[PDB]
Design a protein around this nucleic acid. Sequence first.
RNA 1: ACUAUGGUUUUUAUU
RNA 2: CUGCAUGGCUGUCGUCAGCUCGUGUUGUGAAAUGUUGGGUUAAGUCCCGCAACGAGCGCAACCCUUAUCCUUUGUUGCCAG
RNA 3: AGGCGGCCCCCUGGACGAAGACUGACGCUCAGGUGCGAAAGCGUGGGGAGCAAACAGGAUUAGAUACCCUGGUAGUCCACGCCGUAAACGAUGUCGACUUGGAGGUUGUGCCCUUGAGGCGUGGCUUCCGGAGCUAACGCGUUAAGUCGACCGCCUGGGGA
Lengths: 150, 218, 51
Amino acid sequence: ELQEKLIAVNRVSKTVKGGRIFSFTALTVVGDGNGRVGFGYGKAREVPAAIQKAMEKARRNMINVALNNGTLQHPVKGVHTGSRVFMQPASEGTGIIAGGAMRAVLEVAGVHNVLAKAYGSTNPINVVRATIDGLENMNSPEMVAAKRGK
Amino acid sequence: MLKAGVHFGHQTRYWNPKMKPFIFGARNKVHIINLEKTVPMFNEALAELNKIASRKGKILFVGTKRAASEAVKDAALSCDQFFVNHRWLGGMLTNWKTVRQSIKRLKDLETQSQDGTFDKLTKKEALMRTRELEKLENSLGGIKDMGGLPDALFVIDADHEHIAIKEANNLGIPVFAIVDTNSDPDGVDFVIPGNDDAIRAVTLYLGAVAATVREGRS
Amino acid sequence: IKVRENEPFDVALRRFKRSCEKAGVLAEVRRREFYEKPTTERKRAKASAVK
RNA sequence: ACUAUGGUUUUUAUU
RNA sequence: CUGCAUGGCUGUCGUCAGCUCGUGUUGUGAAAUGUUGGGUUAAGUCCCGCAACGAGCGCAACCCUUAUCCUUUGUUGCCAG
RNA sequence: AGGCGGCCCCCUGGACGAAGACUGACGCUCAGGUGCGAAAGCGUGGGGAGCAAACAGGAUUAGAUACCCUGGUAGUCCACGCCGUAAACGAUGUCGACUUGGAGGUUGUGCCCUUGAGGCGUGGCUUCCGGAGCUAACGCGUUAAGUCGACCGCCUGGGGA
C-alpha cells in the first residue's frame, strides 16, 4: 500500500570556476498509511529526478509505530540540532492543526489527528527529521501492565 | 595448558576491569583468565553457530594476517565457508552492491587466467592480467563466491580488526570472538576466554569450528 | 662534548649532530606532545643508565 | 634596492 | 541599423593532465572523500598505500610518416654479362 | 587580575592533606560600601648612562613626512601621588553537585609478601588527546559550552553613539 509525499522542492545555486551552476533539490516522505514512514532528501539535474532520489532515501529506512485511535499512544519529543518537535495526542477525532513539515510525515503513516508543534529553527528538513526522531520516541502498547492507567 | 603459551602471567596494567566474569583471580598482582571453562563456553556457543551450519547459512571467517590466512585460504576448501584475506575496503559489507563490480572483474580475470590462451605471451599478454589479480585477491580472494551478506562473523583478531565489528554490528550481524584479560566487548555477541597471541592454538581453534561448519554437509 | 678542545685550535668545528636544535632539545616545538606521548618510539630512558 | 595607478553599471534557474 | 534580438562560424593556455558520474561513508547541509598523499612517466601512464571502488571525456593506441631487408608492380621509365 | 624573576638576611600574606579534637547551620551570594595597574600621561621633587618620540643633518625616492644613519628632548628610573586605562583576551561572574577513558608532571596523605635501578592507593594543583551530551560551527569534554539548585549584573541591527 505504498504512498509518497513531496513536502518541499526548490532550486539551488553553487559556485564553480568564474561563475555559477543551478540544480534541483527535494524533501520527501514515504509510508504505508498504517504504521510506518521513512524520510528522504535528494539533489539532481532535472526536478523529477531530484524528487526520485529523495524517494529512494525515504525507502532506505522506515520507522514503524503502533498508532492508537489514529493518533499517538502517548506524548512524544523529537530533536534534530536546533529543531525541537513535541506532540500531544488528540481527542474527539479533531485537532489537525500542525504545518506540513510535521503533518505530512504523519498523514503518510495513517495519523488522522495530532497536536504537533515545532520549536526553535524552522528549516523543514530538520523539522521533518525531528518529527522522525519523535516517531523513534514513541513506544508500543498497552501490554506491559505496569501502571494502573489511565 | 591450553597453550595459551603466553599464560604466566605478566603486566599488572594490562587487564580491563570489565573482564571480571572471565577472570580466575589474581597472581603476582596480574589478573588472569579462566582457561578451564574455555571449551564449556565454546560448546555453549557451538550450539548457536551449529544452528547456522545445519541450514548452510553464509559464514564469514576473519584470517586477515598472513600466518592465519594460510590456515583458512585452502585448509577450509572442504567446508564451503568465506573469508577475509587482508582488506575491509572501509565498507566492504555496507557497500557490497558496489564491491560487486570488482568481484565480477576478479572472476573475469580468473576466467582469463584459466583460459588455454594464457600460456601465450607470459609477459606481453599475462602481466597486465596477473597484476590486477594480485590486487583483487588481497581484497576479495576468499569472499568472491559469497554472493551477499554474512549470517554470522567469526574472528580471532578482534583486538585490532575493529572494522569487522563496525561493519557487522551496523548490519545487525552477530560476532563470535575470543577474549583476553584486556578485551572490551560491546558489539560482539559470543565470547570465549583464551589468548589472541601466537598462531597455533588460534588457527587450530578456527580449524575446530571449521569442522562444525563442514558438518553442515558442504 | 662537541667543541671540548681548549687552548690550540684549527679549522671550523661548528657544525655537529645531537643536542641543540633536534635530537633532543629546541626546534620541532609545533609537534608539542610528540615530545612525551610516543614513549618507547622516541624516548629510550627509562632508568638504570644515564637517568 | 626600486617599480605608482585602473570610476559607476554590465551573466546562466528552461515545463 | 541591430554581435546586448539569434544561429552558423571564431581567440588561446597546450596539445597542459585534467574535467565529470553511480554507490558507500562523512556533514546540519552546499558539499567533501573519490581524482588528494608517496614515487615513476610525456601522462589521473603505471608503481606504493588505501574510506573508498569503479566509470565517461581527455592521455595511450588507432590513423599517419621515415630508414633496413624480402616479396609484389614496370611504359612514352630503367640496364649487368 | 595586572602581574611578579636576579645574590643574601629579617619580617610576612595566601594554598593543601590524614586521623582525631571544638562550636553546633556559626554558612553562600551580595545593590550600595571598602580595597588593587601591565603601559602611556599628568602632579610635587629628583635624576639622565642606555634607548628615544618631537626636531635637525644626510641618504634612498616622483616625494620619503618611513626603513637606513649621525645626534636628541619628553618619558623610561626613583620618594612617591592621582587615574582606574587595555587584546585588563588563556573571551570561562561567585557558590553547589553527578558523570568516562588515556598519556604525563608536581604536591600532600596513607599503604606495599617493595628482590624495582621503586611500586600502588587517595586528596589539591595540572598539560594534552578522547567517549556521552550541548552548540549553526569551532569545539566544550569530570579543572565542561553535558546535567542542575542559590545570588548579583548584562543582551534584543548596523551608520549616527
